Structure formats: structure tokens, C-alpha cells
Amino acid sequence: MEINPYLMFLNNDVTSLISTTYPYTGPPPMSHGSSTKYTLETIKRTYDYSRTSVEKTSKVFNIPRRKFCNCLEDKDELVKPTGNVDISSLLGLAEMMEKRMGEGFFKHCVMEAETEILKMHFSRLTEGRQTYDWTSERNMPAATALQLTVDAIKETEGPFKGTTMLEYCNKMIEMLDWKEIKFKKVIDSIKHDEFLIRALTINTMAKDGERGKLQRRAIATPGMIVRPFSKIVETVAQKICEKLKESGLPVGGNEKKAKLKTTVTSLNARMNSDQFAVNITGDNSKWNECQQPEAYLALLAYITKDSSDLMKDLCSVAPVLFCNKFVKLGQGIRLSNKRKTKEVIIKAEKMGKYKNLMREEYKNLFEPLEKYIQKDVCFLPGGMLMGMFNMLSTVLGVSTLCYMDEELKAKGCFWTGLQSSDDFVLFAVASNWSNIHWTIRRFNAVCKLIGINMSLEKSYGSLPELFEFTSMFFDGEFVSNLAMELPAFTTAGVNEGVDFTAAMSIIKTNMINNSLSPSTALMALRICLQEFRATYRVHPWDSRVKGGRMKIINEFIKTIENKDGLLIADGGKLMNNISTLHIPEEVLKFEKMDEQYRNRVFNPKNPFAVVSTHSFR
Amino acid sequence: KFPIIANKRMLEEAQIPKEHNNVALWVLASASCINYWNFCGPCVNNSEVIKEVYKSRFGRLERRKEIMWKELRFTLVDPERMELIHALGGETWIQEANTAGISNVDQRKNDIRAVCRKVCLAANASIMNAKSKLVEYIKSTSMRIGETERKLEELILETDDVSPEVTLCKSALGGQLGKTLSFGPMLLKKISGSGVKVKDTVYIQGVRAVQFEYWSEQEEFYGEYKSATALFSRKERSLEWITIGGGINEDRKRLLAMCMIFCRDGDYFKDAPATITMADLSTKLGREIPYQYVMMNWIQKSEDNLEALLYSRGIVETNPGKMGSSMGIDGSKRAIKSLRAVTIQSGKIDMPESKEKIHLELSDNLEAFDSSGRIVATILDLPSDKKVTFQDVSFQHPDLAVLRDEKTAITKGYEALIKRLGTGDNDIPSLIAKKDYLSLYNLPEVKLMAPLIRPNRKGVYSRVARKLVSTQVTTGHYSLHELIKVLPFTYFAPKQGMFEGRLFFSNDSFVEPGVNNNVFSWSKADSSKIYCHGIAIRVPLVVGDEHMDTSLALLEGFSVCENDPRAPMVTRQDLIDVGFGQKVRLFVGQGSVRTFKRT
Amino acid sequence: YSRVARKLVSTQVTTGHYSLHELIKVLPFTYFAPKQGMFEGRLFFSNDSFVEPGVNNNVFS
């Protein structure tokens, strides 16, 4: 006998079994690292996708500046990625989109973003995945580096009493011109150029956690200076993407399916009996190595052209900050003797000192870039490595999709679709099995004009019924999702009265998005409960455990009868179910907990979501 | 060790000693300190404040508690609820939970149609008394329909809801019809034309032959399936043209296949698939079946059969200007290739109405005939028998319901064992006080329950049960619960063998002493009750100590004793090689360990 | 146990194909009179320590 766990795909669909193809969600044990090898290949492919050779030495660093925008050359083999952007076509597409949506559209959106920012407190910057400290030269949460920056400002030139985003930004600006800056270390100070560099430094993070593909080997990790301007630009781009029908970035699921079906139905009701449509599942390649902040700057200028000069100048900050971005090279190379009994370790700044020892592969990837190196970093003048400006990239993609001219109209063909950050789905329309090819080629050309490329080994197409988008494998029916998320206690331990409620809410959400079903949700619940217990080293009372926390619980338990009312953290049992997720177990056991136990737990006169006497400050 | 921070005065004011029982608890502190604080600490009364502050959450809980849960149903798409929409309705399923509104009519329709299906099926057990047994079932079936205790002899008529079962049961009542038809689950209707019956043959395996019938003239109809309309014309055993206005893939596919069978178009009416030859059984247990219903059943088995049937229908390449009204193999609204003589469109085809009532004539197989044949309904167009709990119903005539299962058999056996007690002589307590257990091994009720016992290894079960019975009687220490539990096994003769710890019936269920189970459970503080699948039963007597002595109801030749961890854990097998004065621990259930000593 | 022990002994002695390391183990049980019962594989002493006829254990190896 033999086995083949794919024969079930013959007499069945794929929307029902595709889940079996990918492992279960969780932290990737691959340990995708960010090494000097990886940092250098990326930079090379970046400079190469720029099909030009022009440069211009600066005046703030005495360094060349590869200006890869509006200077396209090397037309040969243009099916491969490109990064040289054309401003004329960009502004033309922006104008088309404006005309479609309306005239005072960009103005209204920028006004909303402004007013939202005004009442904003700089403290918001503490809400971020991670950043890069410019003093310790490391990566940390936002709050830590923020405290470092504010206390350094205090130590050097007095405190920052703004308590607002705008004063913070202006303080950063002023600091750009300070000659000497101080900070507590292991105390030390620095000069103007070094502080500038540090502020324009970036570090490659190894973390890449998500479903689909973990292509984020070297996800960026900027500092704190540019953070608020990036937040502002993202707020504006978000306010814009909301009004756009073909923008699935800000949210997903129910709304996403609504957008899908609206699009499909409008299409079906649009064309005629002679036309026949088609779909394409596209996947933009190198969406980070072909997005240039210069085009973003010109676009923001064209946007704010008619608005308060305040926003005109503000939106023009993060772009220039990305036009000049020093990239921190990872850990340096290491030497070794033949038998490997000895091994030197060297940093990146000195690899230019032993370039003779290194093997030819590393040697042909290091010399052409030595020009752009200063001490240990690389002056990257463009590209976009961070997972930032995703909203803005999506806006540019939608601009690409809202194109239409008379050359197409004459042939009776057109297109439309939807675009995520770097993944999209196209729907072409025509009346011949050949004009479809012409339309596809036209679309690819207009996309390549502005660096937006497409893959050939990962982008396919077929008739309209079948496609895929953001793991939501759409079909004639039976829309199947695969974005099943889950919590993680060991990595994020907060309290024994919040994690469980948060997990219940998460499961509820996943059910809403149809990524989970009743039985699946119940199994996940009974699994997360055990994970929680094992995390905090707690068990029920029926169990014959001998752990520390159980000892006392093994003696002060007979003093109660409302075992049902007991808390999970205290030898309790579950009572919540599908229809009782939004309801925390506490609210569900209040009237049931013994008066003595309820009161012992609810005592604000204690040494320390329903605020329990279960917190771990 | 002490990562968790705390306050200092808050600690001393509560008098929290460190290392209470070798647990430090601690400025810093451990986590166990919280348990010590919530188990032995200060007492407040802040319930009202907490509730007021968390009013929104507790109002959500209240609302939740203010629900009347209803049934659920699997189906598709043709604020206070947003808090629960996640648990209210998905996409394949939905729950009809309501809040304040009540109207019991459509549920009543489902009930009446279900029971009509049931009864009409029940009448399909003979060959001659069909109509008679049917009508007598009807006359013996009353219901608390809605709120009124009505009978099922007027509802079938007073109601106006077309269905195969309603019609099949009302024709026998000489009731009015509406000219509607039912070919399987599909609903049909005539529009124009007419014809006469004609016979033809069809092969099976390429050698045999079977006769079917059809019509030779032209005639147009109005098909209709779940969320799918249609119109079509049949001519000479073949489908000429057809159109559809309800856009769904599966619905359209199945409706088209059913209309094709209704038109008998296709080559599988000349020969048959190689799957049918596997059976060639166009027959029931003792009845005959046409070819159409056999083909249909063959479709219901798998959609591959549907695809094969549709391929039998010619497939061609669509021409320009027709994509908008073309079709695909999978119901695709438009395609570069479609099927012959098809037309897709949007908007459901408005169905006509016939205001002419008639009466039909039932046959041996209950098939009704209005005129010129033209069968309107039958049992063949029904689903298989589906057991469903019926309430608000009374069904008196035999064949009403088997009402006989191993579970119910055991329940009744135990009820009889309990009643036999009867607080009198020649009953359980008298024989106990008399110490005459042998008679217990000869009662009638145990003899009635014996057939429910696993036969292969009943001797050992009887041996063990008699052991327990005698050991609890002679000494006078016993427990009526475990006794009654094991009694049904003390009928056959004892034999040697290997026992495991469970007594298995014939239905693969089991029972175990010293523990509780769904089939049989009980507990102290309610000893006057005995649960059987949750059904609480009463004891004709009262006891406060007759049950408290279970030291001999766990094992056969042993007795419980004081707990002792030093004693080694053992199994049920090595017990034979133990001695006296030798304590031993052993599991008595799930994570339940107890110590035992011989005798 | 006595029955079983005597059985083994005769079986080994009548032929000549014996293992001296098993008689020295099982003999102490042949002193009493045979009886009827189910032998469950192990020969216990009065101190909850047994020996098994054919496999080595902590008590006799």
C-alpha cells in the first residue's frame, strides 16, 4: 500500500482542504536572521534595480548620491525589477484618481488628519512594535527610547514641557542643529554630525511573524526622530484609503468580503453579453526595494498643494529623512585558520581593512559599496525597507488601477481590481482572447513606469470565478480564510485576569472573520485554557498536584462551597462558552462566588477588564 | 523568585506571614501571596460599587441572561445583536435565537410536514393495507398544535402549503389540490401542451433491459428548486430548450439535472452506468422502482455523477453576444464554452398560479393520479427515514413508534428493581435483614434484564456481582445503590476468567462499581435519588446509613481502610497474590486512589 | 506455587535437560502440598518480594 494526502483534491474542492497545506499559526522556529551577508545583497539589488548611473556629491557628508528617479537608462531586459520613477505619469494618475473621487477629496482627508493630530499627545509614540535607540545603539520598545530621549534633552538643554506631538517634532528639529548633546551612559556627549547620523541610523531586525510568507528577514527598525512624521503620513494615507473601494489594508474580513462581492457584482452588471472578463492573482516582488521616498514627497506636495502650508512642510519631513538613511551593517565577518583551532572576530567598519582575506563572493559584493560607507554603515539614499508607508503604497497602487484612456475605449476593453500593500487581484475585460493580452501588457507597462513590478513565478491568472487575496481563497462560493491568529502567554505575560479575556475576545474576532467555526473555537478555547494554566503554573482542585501555589490552595479550599465560582487562577473551573465570551468569567461568577471569597478578592485596600486582586505590576 | 511588586504597610496591616507553610510570599512578593490574600485576609463590602462602575459589562451579562435560545439550521445566503452576531449567525449555519417576539406558525408548519412525512412512511410496511393503515394512523394521531390540542384529520386540509407529503396524505381524504406537482424535492408545473404515455427500454451492463415510460408530445413546464427558477420544454424523451433566472451554481446544477431526468434526455436512458450494474436493483425491500428515481439516487451519492450526467448533455463553445446568457459546467454565470440549449439570466422567473382544485386517486403504492396519468406525488420522492423527537403529540395506534432501545430497556429494568423494594416482605430489605441473598439471584426482574447483558463473558460478571452481594449481605454492611447497580448480572452461573473493572451490556455500554456514570449515578446528600441518563428516579424507601457503608461495594474480597501512601500501587490482576494485613493503594476511578486491605 | 515448582522439577529431572539456576530458585516452594488455583506468573514470599521462573530480577539474577 501507498499514501498520497492529495487525492482528496480530486472529488472535492480546494477551498475546503487548502488549510491542510500550511502548518498551524505560531512563532516561526526558523529563526530568520539579519546577517551582514543578507544586509549587503539587499543593498546591491537595490542599487541595481536602479537602471541609472548618475550621482551628485552632497555638501553635508561629501558623499555621492545615486539619484534614481526620472533618469531611466539601461532599458534592456526591462521585465526585471525597476526603481526609476517618472513624476509626470505619477501626477497624472493622481489627477485621474482625484477627478474620479472628487476635487476637495485630498483636502478633506488632510484636514481630518490634521485636526486628529492637533489633539494628539506625543505619548502616543510609545505605541509601537520596536525602534532603535540612538544612544545605546540597540533596539527596544518605543517607551524606553522615548524616556531616554526626553531625559537626555533634560540633561543637556532642560526639559521638554510641550506635552504634544508638534512641540516634540519642533524639539527634534532644533536638536538637529545642536552642536553638543548629552546623555547618561554606563555620562557622555556627542557632536552634531554623529548625532545626525545616529538619528538617521537604521537597524535590521530578525523578527518576522505572520501567516503566508515571512519575507521580512531584515525588517527595518528606525529610531524615534522620524517616528511622529511617519505616523502623520500614515494617518493621512489611511484617511485616504478609507474612501477607496479597492483598499483592503485598513481592515479585513467581513468588510473585505463585502468589497470583493461589491466589486464582482458591479463588474457583472457593468459589461455586456459580448464581453468576457478574467482574473489575475498578482504578487508584487521587491515592494520594498523599488519604493522611493522622492516620488512620495512629490505626491504629498501635489496633494497638499491647496491647504495649510503647515501640512505642506510637515508631510515633507519623513520623505527627506528616508532619502538620506544610513543603514547599520549587521555583525561583521569572522576569520579562521585551516584546522579552525583559532578564529578572529571583526566588525563591519574594518572589513574594508582585510578585503584581501575575504572570499571572492563577499569581495565582489563589498568593493563597489565602499564608497557609500562612512564608518560601519551604508548611506542608502532611497528605497523603502521598513514595513512603513503601506497605506501610501496602496494609494499609489489604486492610482495605477484607476487609469483609463481612449486607446482602450476604442477597443472595448478595460480593467479594475483590488490591491493590498504588495499583493493584488486584477479583473480584466475585453471581447477577444487576444485583446486581453494587450490589456495585460498595457497594465504591466503602466505599473513598471513607476517601479511597481510584478512576479512571473508567483503571479497567475484564470477565468473570473477563481482567485486568491490575502489568504482569502475566493471561489464561486465557500469563501475560505486562513488568517487564524492565536495568543502567546510566555512571550506576552501581563496578568492572570487579562490574558484570558483577551484570548476570548481574539477567538470571538476570528469567528467573526469566519476563520474559525464553533467546534474549532471550542477546541481552541480548551487549549488556551491549558496553556494559561501551565504558564502561570496553576491547576484545578480536583487534580492531585503538588505545586507551590497549590499547597495553600490544597488547605484553604474546604472552607468554600461555590467551587463553580472559583477563579481559574485559584483552582477554578470554566463556565464561559461561545455565547459568553464578551463576558469575563469574573462578571459571570460574581453573584456565585461565596461572600467571603468574593470580598477577599474585591478589596481595594490591598497591596496592589474587571480590576481584580490578580495583577503582577 | 519575587518578581511581583507589592506595598509594605498594606502587607503588615494584613498580617501576612512569610513561609506560612514553606511559601515565602515576599517591595517584592511572589504570586502565591495573592492566593494567601484571597483565601485568608481582610473582608470588605464593595459589591455595589464594583457593579455600578462596571455597569456596562454587567448589563451585557444581564442582556445575555435575558435570551430565549432557539433552534439552529444549516443554510446559506439564498447593535445588541452585533455584540453577539459572532455566535448568532455565520455563513453555513445560523441560530434563530429571539429576544421578545413570538409567533409559532412556521415552526408549526415544519412540525406538521415532518409528522406527515413520518406517518406516510410508516404506512409503507405492507402491500395491501396501505390506505387503511395510513388513515387509521391519522385518526390515532392528535397534537397540541401551537396552543390548541387539535387532531391531525383537519390540519392537513385547513392548511395551505404544497408539499409531497401533504398532498399524498390529503388525497386519501378527498381533499382539494392546487394542480402542483412534485418530482423529488423539485417542484414542477405545466404551462402548455399535452401528450400521452409511451414505453421504451434501457440496458444495464449491455445485456439486460428494463422498461420505462415517458411522453412523446411537446409540453412546456416551470421547474423550480431552492433559490432557482426555470422554464423548459420537453419533446419526445428529450429536452428541447430551457432557461433559468436564479443564479446559483449548485442550485442551478441540481435543478437542471432534475429537469433533464424529468425529460429523460441523455444516453444513460439508453444504457446505464457501470455503477448501476453493481446493483441493478431498481427495487425496494419488496417493491419495484422506476429508472428515474434510481438515477436520482445515483446522483445524490456524489456530484461526480451530476457532472457525468451534464457531460452526457452536449457541451459546445459559446459564440459572441451569448456569454451574458451562457452557462458553465459548474454553474458559472458566463463562460467561453457552455452547454447545448441553455440560457442563463438574472431575476427569478415569476411563477404562475392555478386556481382550479381537484381530487386524485391513490394506488397500491399510494401514487396519486389526477388524469391522463400525470403522477403528482408519491413516497419515492421522499427522503430516507429520519428519526426526530416529536412533542405536543399523541400517537396511539400500533406502529406509532417502536419505543424500544437498549437504553430504555435498562432504564425500565432498574425502575423495576427499585420498585420491587416496596417496603415490605418478600422484597429487598426483608431479604437483607434475613440474609437470604440466594433468592436475589432468582428474581424475575433480573431475568428480564439478563438479555441486555454481554453474553460472551457474563459468567464472570455474575460471579463478581454475587461475590459483592454476599459479602455485603452476610456482614450486614452494604449500600442499596451499588447492589441494585450490580444485581442484573446475578442471574447466570459463575465461571473463572479475567475481570477488568467494568460490566458491559450488549449495547457496548458498561457499568462500574464504586463510581458514577451516565447510565447510573448517585451521590450522598441526595441519596433518595438515582440518576439514569439524567433522569432522576425516587426510592420507595428512606435511608441514612444503609448506603453510608460502601467499604465492600468497591472490590470483592477487600475492604477500604485508612489512607497510607507507603502502600504500593497495584492493579486488579495481581490482587490474587496478596496476603492479609497487607495494605495496597489502587485507583478507584479517574485520578481517584484509595487504600484497601483484604477481607 | 508448590505445585508449579514440583512440576518444573520433574520436567527438568525426568529428561536430563535442566538448568541448575532454576531449581535452586524454585525448590523452597516444593515443601508444602499441591493445591488448585490460578498461577499468575510470580512467586511471592512473605515480604512482598517475588521471584519469576525464567527471567532474572532484583531478587535472583
C-alpha grid cell, residue B130: 396501505
Residue pair B225/B254 in contact by the 8 Å Cβ criterion: yes
Nearest CA among A15, A518, A513, A515 for reference residue A257 = A513
For B585, other C-beta atoms within 10 Å of its C-beta total: 17
What does the alpha-carbon distance between residue A605 and residue A495 come to, in Å, rounded to a whole number?
A: 19
What does the alpha-carbon distance between residue A380 and residue A369 come to, in Å, rounded to a whole number?
A: 10
Go through chain C and tell me how many residues it has. Answer: 61
DSSP B508-532: S-EE-TTS--SSSB--TT-TTEEEE
Check CB contact of A8 with chain B, cutoff 8 Å: no
Q: Angle at which helices A293-304 and A390-401 pack, to 10 degrees?
A: 70
Classify residue B398 by burial, with Cβ atoms within 10 Å: 0-12, 13-18, 19+.
Answer: exposed
How many alpha carbons fall within 13 Å on the CB side of residue C61? 4
Contact B320 A581 (CB under 8 A): no
Residue pair B76/B91 in contact by the 8 Å Cβ criterion: yes
Residue pair B185/B382 in contact by the 8 Å Cβ criterion: no
Residues 6+ apart with CB under 8 A from B523: B516
* A315: β partners: none
DSSP A266-314: HHHHHS-SS-EEEEEEEE-S-TTSS--HHHHHHHHHHHHTSS-HHHHHH
Q: Angle at which helices B303-312 and B249-263 pack, to 10 degrees?
A: 60
What does the alpha-carbon distance between residue A146 and residue A139 come to, in Å, rounded to a whole number?
A: 12
For A250, other C-beta atoms within 10 Å of its C-beta total: 15
Secondary structure percentages of chain C, helix, strand, coil, to 5: 40, 5, 55
Residue pair A301/A316 in contact by the 8 Å Cβ criterion: yes
Residue A320, helix vs strand vs coil: helix
Residues 6+ apart with CB under 8 A from B329: B307, B310, B311, B315, B339
Classify residue A519 by burial, with Cβ atoms within 10 Å: 0-12, 13-18, 19+.
Answer: exposed
C48-57 b/e with 16+ CB inside 10 Å = b?
A: eebbebeeee
Strand spans (E) along A407-554: 414-419, 423-430, 460-462
Contacts by residues A186-190 (CB-CB < 8 Å, ≥ 24 positions apart):
A187/A155, A189/A156
Query: Chain B partners of C48 at a C-beta cutoff of 8 Å?
Result: 568, 582
Residue pair B198/B213 in contact by the 8 Å Cβ criterion: yes
Beta strands at B393-395 and B210-215: parallel, antiparallel or unpaired = unpaired
DSSP B90-143: -SSEEE--BSS----SHHHHHHHHHHHHHHHHHTTT-SS-HHHHHHHHHHTEEE
Q: What are the counts of helices (DSSP H) followed by strands (DSSP E) for chain C?
A: 2, 2
CA B340, distance to chain mean position in Å, is: 43
Check CB contact of B107 with chain C, cutoff 8 Å: no
Nearest CA among A464, A559, A608 for reference residue B26 = A608
CA A46, distance to chain mean position in Å, is: 20
CA B119, distance to chain mean position in Å, is: 19
Secondary structure percentages of chain B, helix, strand, coil, to 5: 30, 20, 50
Residues 552-591 of B with CB under 8 A from C: 568, 573-574, 576-577, 579, 582
Query: Chain B partners of C44 at a C-beta cutoff of 8 Å?
Result: 577, 579
C-alpha grid cell, residue C8: 518444573
Check CB contact of C44 with chain B, cutoff 8 Å: yes
For A260, other C-beta atoms within 10 Å of its C-beta total: 18
Residue pair B159/B112 in contact by the 8 Å Cβ criterion: yes
C-alpha grid cell, residue A96: 485621474
Residue of chain A nearest B77, judged by CA positions: A477
- Minimal Cβ distance to A579: which of B3, B54, B87: B87
Q: Where are the alpha helices (DSSP H) in A474-584?
A: 499-512, 518-536, 548-553
Residue type for B375, please? I
Residue A398, H or E segment:
helix A390-401
How far B381 CA lies from chain A's nearest CA (Å)?
Answer: 27
C-alpha grid cell, residue A269: 452588471
Chains linked to C by 3 or more Cβ pairs within 8 Å: B
Based on its alpha-carbon atoms, the radius of gyration of chain B, rounded to whole angstroms, reads 36
Specify the DSSP class assigned to residue B155. H
Residue with cell 508567483: A458
Check CB contact of C39 with chain B, cutoff 8 Å: no
Nearest CA among A86, A70, A52 for reference residue A400 = A86
C-alpha grid cell, residue A409: 475605449
Nearest CA among B124, B173, B37 for reference residue B365 = B124
Classify residue B494 by burial, with Cβ atoms within 10 Å: 0-12, 13-18, 19+.
Answer: middle
Secondary structure percentages of chain A, helix, strand, coil, to 5: 40, 10, 50
Q: Angle at which helices A105-118 and A227-243 pack, to 10 degrees?
A: 140
Nearest CA among B250, B304, B317 for reference residue B275 = B304
Residues 382-441 of A with CB under 8 A from B: 431, 433
What does the alpha-carbon distance between residue B63 and residue B52 come to, in Å, rounded to a whole number?
A: 16
Residue of chain A nearest B67, judged by CA positions: A579
How far C41 CA lies from chain B's nearest CA (Å)?
Answer: 10
Residue type for B7, please? N
Q: Which of A576, A579, A613 to mutate to test the interface with B (most CBs of B within 10 A)?
A: A579
Contact C42 B582 (CB under 8 A): no
Residue A439, helix vs strand vs coil: helix
Residue B197, helix vs strand vs coil: strand
Residues 6+ apart with CB under 8 A from A24: A484
Residue pair B259/B232 in contact by the 8 Å Cβ criterion: yes
Residue A237, helix vs strand vs coil: helix
Handedness of CA B366, B371, B375, B376 (dihedral sign): negative
What does the alpha-carbon distance between residue B11 and residue B26 come to, in Å, rounded to a whole number?
A: 10
What does the alpha-carbon distance between residue B467 and residue B479 come to, in Å, rounded to a whole number?
A: 14
A167-190 b/e with 16+ CB inside 10 Å = b?
A: ebbebbeebeebeebbbeeeeeeb
What does the alpha-carbon distance between residue A520 and residue A540 come to, in Å, rounded to a whole number?
A: 24
C-alpha grid cell, residue B536: 432522576
Residue with cell 411522453: B215
Residue pair B1/B25 in contact by the 8 Å Cβ criterion: no
Residue pair A316/A297 in contact by the 8 Å Cβ criterion: yes
Residue pair A57/A65 in contact by the 8 Å Cβ criterion: yes
Residue with cell 512467586: C43
Say what the resolution is, in angstroms: 3.3
* Chains B and C lie in contact, requiring 3 or more CB pairs less than 8 Å apart: yes
What does the alpha-carbon distance between residue B416 and residue A413 come to, in Å, rounded to a whole number?
A: 83
Residue pair A162/A171 in contact by the 8 Å Cβ criterion: yes
How far B251 CA lies from chain A's nearest CA (Å)?
Answer: 12
Contact C48 B582 (CB under 8 A): yes
What does the alpha-carbon distance between residue A170 and residue C1 come to, in Å, rounded to a whole number?
A: 97
What does the alpha-carbon distance between residue A219 and residue A286 come to, in Å, rounded to a whole number?
A: 13
Nearest CA among A258, A214, A240, A235 for reference residue A94 = A240
Phi, psi dihedral angles at B3 (to 5 degrees): -60, -35
Beta strands at A325-328 and A201-202: parallel, antiparallel or unpaired = parallel
Strand spans (E) along A431-518: 460-462
Query: Chain A partners of B90 at a C-beta cutoff of 8 Å?
Result: 511, 514, 517
Classify residue A312 by burial, with Cβ atoms within 10 Å: 0-12, 13-18, 19+.
Answer: middle
What does the alpha-carbon distance between residue A361 and residue A348 come to, in Å, rounded to a whole number?
A: 16
What does the alpha-carbon distance between residue A93 and residue A402 come to, in Å, rounded to a whole number?
A: 8
HEC profile for B310-340?
HHHCCEEECCCCCHHHCCCCCCCCCCCEEEC
For B384, other C-beta atoms within 10 Å of its C-beta total: 7
What does the alpha-carbon distance between residue A507 and residue A486 come to, in Å, rounded to a whole number?
A: 8
Strand spans (E) along A304-413: 325-328, 377-380
What does the alpha-carbon distance between residue C29 and residue A268 come to, in Å, rounded to a whole number?
A: 94
What does the alpha-carbon distance between residue A197 and residue B94 come to, in Å, rounded to a whole number?
A: 59
C-alpha grid cell, residue A357: 582575506
Phi, psi dihedral angles at A503 (to 5 degrees): -65, -40
Residue pair B239/B213 in contact by the 8 Å Cβ criterion: no
Residue A585, helix vs strand vs coil: helix
Residue pair A319/A296 in contact by the 8 Å Cβ criterion: yes
What does the alpha-carbon distance between residue B270 and residue B203 come to, in Å, rounded to a whole number?
A: 6
Phi, psi dihedral angles at B6 (to 5 degrees): -155, -175
Nearest CA among B162, B328, B345, B314 for reference residue B243 = B345
What does the alpha-carbon distance between residue A238 and residue A250 come to, in Å, rounded to a whole number?
A: 7
C-alpha grid cell, residue B599: 477481607
